[PDB]
Write a protein that binds this ligand. Structure first.
Ligand SMILES: c1ccc(CCc2n[nH]c3ccccc23)cc1
Ligand SMILES: c1ccc(CCc2n[nH]c3ccccc23)cc1
Ligand SMILES: c1ccc(CCc2n[nH]c3ccccc23)cc1
Ligand SMILES: c1ccc(CCc2n[nH]c3ccccc23)cc1
Lengths: 546, 546
């Protein structure tokens, strides 16, 4: 019974096979068939290529040896390599052209999700070329999805040598009959077969996956669209910045490039962005996913005034100062969406671009008290219930698992009604004691929120709603301003509190505003529709944030 | 008696005064004298400029209002503004041209070092221009060196209004007679003088500093070259990455740009790079200053084998994987210098560039045991003393303050002799009980190392020296290789163990190697000669690491 799946890289997890470029080059330059492939494998186990694959020499050291073999091969064939014949040039193009074979990665991902140990076993080199970063990026993206990465140049062994297969079985801690091995080179399959491993010769991905599905008894072909990569909290880089004597801000950090600061809503976590963090880092950005003040590993002072927008924004500026960042793109959701529009209004020089999910920008009404305004909208009733210190804390802290299970539901999953919350005397009065688990979340993901909220509870988080008069007076200072930096407004069709129509007048204050819209999406945008959020954010980041 | 110094920005901390560009523009376009300055100040307290400076409107909103004032002014003057007259163009150039007035910053720095409260008080705007980042960077660089930054657009008040001066005195928590106020605009000095503050009209910096020196009784002019900016540990962003179940790596992070990974030596800290971190971040790099395995907030497992180079390098690769970095430039010193050359040899695709301070690259001798080789050099005697587990730990852990005070000394400060350490029976046998404080370090900086080493002591650090046979066998695998990625070797004239001559044969293994050399520099390169280390590293980073 199979419990391990091993994949080759070239011609299996990455396409087109860098190998096959040699045949393409021979044809393009009208060279004798097999000339390049023969020069490449010259001397077999004794040759330059075996030394390269074993890690004895680097790729740059190998380039002139491959050139000498090409000359030897051409002279025997009574032919002439052209004027401009360059191995480096051919090699550079071949690697640049090679991309991840997405359906093969998806199958490996599905097997690992079903309890399989997965590994990449590859004949590779020590790349010291000036353009080595492209391959480094490819390897980084691929390797994260596997339990093991076994590279010939690192282990000093090579396929088809029997030692590498014995090494592979030892790292897997599996007997050969428990292993599926996929390779595009028949000679490399032979020792695995000879040991009793299930082997698949990979020509076209589809046939290989049909064989793989048949042998594992797991559907890999024609499977529903997979969710984006998520985050494992213990595998993240955790950052901590003191913004003032009693306040420290926690964040999760991934990727390189322009800084993208993610600001969650109420009652959330940096983890609310779990499906966005790997995707945005992969798209070429440095992601900084915050635990906002009052949440998770960030400080939670008790005072209401510590949570007004002026102080929250000032602390976010200090956060950038201390990290040495002159700017960041600010992406917010719910309360974070509100903070993010105010960062753009009060500190435009520190905000590269601004994006909000669900939260529209509506300016302060100087002719009405915020209480009058909030009362003038039945869906904002829950905010009046959040006003009296202690009441909502007691209800939200009674049973954490029930709290998150009741809150975190898709638009069609008996989502809490925000109308008549005060009258009913609570958010969960008509909610079950043991709510069912929503399709959006696993039991483990609920437990992460439970563990996070065990530290400070709901006082700090609820205090974000307890500064209406303070925020109104501060916001009134910005009434003559306009948001003229790049801006994105993402609406969610089925958010019944932060309704798409609430964002209708935004163009009056943000004339150059760009928009996104998610159909069949509730309040929990990031986990409800992760694939579409990623697509909207990446597209807007690449076009307007750089 | 003075205890506070307030500085204006334009024409005081930053030059040329963005104001003075208006006069330069009038002259260049042969416009009537004062035309641009008159349009700029149009309507005085009622005008567009006062609204801009108070934060009512943003810079982009102000641009068309300034244009309308310029038209009004030109029509009254019976003149014609040219075809291509653009306020944005003039304004963009003016800000780009404006730089920090370094001697004025130096004086502010010296006053703060002598116990003064320092502040920047400025009439500024909310910058939402597409090129706002340049100014954001300038403000970030400047603001860090001051206790307070008071911006007109943030406080809704403006100079010369008396309210801003009362606000300034309140934030300073000082009576007017305790304050020096420096400004280039006479009208803005008037309310400060009228309140009893010492005022300086800034025309040329030199005269202003002569007045400032005379009034404070502190030498500010003709002062010796100041040391680079250092780090305050509690003001840094602290990062934590788990590389494997029992191992977590700590790092300090500052700046944006290409990642630069700093690797300290023995027995050190991330803090050994305190003078490099602000400088490299300021030069356009993302600095990652490590606590290497066994040190500070990084894990310190007891096992010797956890500290061999193969495992240390593998963990540094995992560190990059978990942060989502495909590459970093690796800069090492002492043991970190050794790790860094091995990162280049075994993982060139992950190393953008490699630099070493003092530590040369000398390949393994396959025809000699590492013990034979180490014994063949009298200065490496101390390494044999470090071999027996517990002996060096006991001596180095007996009195931490004595340990760091004895170790951390300049070449002319009775630096410990590394010859006959075994014979003498210890490093400190001929060293005083209470060593004097070296010129390189303060008492507080010694105490930071003391506090750091209180957690794990010297076992983990000493284990870096206890893998000679393991490192030799691993290094022998790389004997056919060459380092062909960008590389820098920095030698120190007076390091009597890692002598410059030890690096003489490096070009045979690193043909494209670049060099740096520091005269009158001992083993503690970074703190001995910080200004020159920064200059060598920045120059090499900008030319070879990008
Ligand atoms: C998520 C839900 C609501 C809010 C802002 C609350 C609000 N909604 N409408 C208002 C009118 C005046 C003052 C405050 C408000 C932020 C994030
Ligand atoms: C607090 C109570 C209920 C919910 C789910 C219902 C909801 N849907 N849309 C919202 C916008 C702001 C506040 C609440 C909601 C989130 C946070
Ligand atoms: C700082 C001082 C010494 C070393 C390496 C030790 C060494 N110095 N010379 C050697 C010869 C063979 C094996 C190891 C060594 C690294 C960092
Ligand atoms: C351990 C003992 C002494 C010193 C100062 C003397 C010294 N100078 N140069 C060195 C190179 C490697 C190891 C030691 C030294 C540093 C670390």
């Amino acid at each position: 019974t199979l419990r391990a799946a091993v994949f080759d890289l070239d011609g299996v997890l990455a396409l087109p096979a860098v190998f096959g470029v040699l045949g393409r080059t021979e044809e393009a330059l009208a060279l004798p068939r097999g000339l390049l492939n023969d020069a490449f494998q010259k001397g077999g186990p004794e040759g330059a290529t075996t030394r390269l694959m074993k890690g004895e020499i680097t790729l740059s050291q190998w380039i002139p040896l491959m050139e000498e073999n090409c000359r030897k091969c051409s002279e025997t064939a009574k032919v002439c390599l052209p004027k401009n014949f360059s191995i480096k040039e051919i090699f550079d193009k071949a690697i640049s052209a090679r991309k991840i074979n997405r359906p093969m990665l998806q199958a490996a991902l599905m097997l690992r999700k079903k309890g399989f140990t997965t590994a990449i076993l590859t004949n590779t080199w020590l790349d010291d070329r000036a353009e080595r970063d492209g391959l480094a990026q490819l390897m980084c993206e691929l390797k994260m999805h596997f339990d093991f990465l076994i590279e010939s140049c690192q282990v000093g062994m090579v396929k088809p040598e029997p030692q590498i297969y014995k090494f592979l079985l030892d790292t897997l801690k599996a007997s050969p009959s428990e292993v599926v091995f996929l390779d595009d080179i028949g000679a490399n399959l032979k020792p695995a077969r000879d040991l009793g491993m299930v082997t698949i010769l990979v020509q076209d991905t589809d046939t290989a996956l049909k064989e793989l599905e048949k042998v594992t008894g797991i559907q890999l072909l024609n499977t529903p669209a997979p969710l984006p990569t998520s985050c494992n909290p213990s595998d993240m880089s955790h950052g901590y910045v003191t913004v003032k004597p009693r306040v420290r801000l926690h964040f999760v950090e991934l990727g390189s490039g322009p800084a993208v600061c993610l600001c969650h809503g109420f009652p959330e976590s940096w983890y609310s962005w779990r499906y966005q963090i790997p995707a945005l880092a992969q798209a070429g950005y440095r992601v900084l996913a915050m635990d906002m003040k009052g949440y998770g590993e960030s400080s939670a002072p008790p005072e209401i005034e510590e949570y007004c927008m002026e102080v929250l924004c000032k602390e976010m500026v200090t956060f950038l100062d201390k990290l040495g960042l002159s700017q960041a793109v600010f992406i917010g959701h719910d309360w974070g969406g509100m903070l993010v529009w105010y960062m753009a209004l009060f500190y435009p020089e520190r905000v590269r671009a601004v994006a909000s999910l669900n939260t529209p920008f509506i300016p302060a009404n100087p002719n009405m008290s915020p209480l009058e305004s909030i009362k003038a909208n039945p869906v904002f009733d829950y905010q009046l219930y959040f006003q009296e210190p202690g009441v909502a804390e007691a209800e939200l802290e009674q049973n954490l698992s029930r709290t998150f299970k009741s809150l975190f539901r898709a638009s069609d999953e008996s989502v809490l009604s925000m109308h008549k919350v005060c009258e009913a005397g609570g958010l969960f009065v008509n909610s079950p004691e043991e709510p069912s688990l929503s399709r959006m979340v696993t039991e483990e993901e609920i437990q992460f929120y439970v563990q996070q909220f065990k530290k400070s509870g709901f006082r700090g988080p609820l205090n974000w709603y307890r500064n209406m008069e303070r925020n109104w007076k501060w916001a009134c200072k910005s009434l003559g301003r306009k948001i003229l930096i790049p801006a994105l407004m993402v609406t969610a069709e089925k958010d019944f509190v932060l309704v798409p129509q609430m964002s209708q007048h935004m163009e009056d204050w943000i004339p150059h505003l760009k928009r996104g819209h998610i159909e069949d999406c509730g309040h929990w945008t990031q986990m409800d529709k992760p694939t579409e959020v990623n697509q909207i954010l990446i597209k807007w980041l690449d076009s307007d944030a750089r």
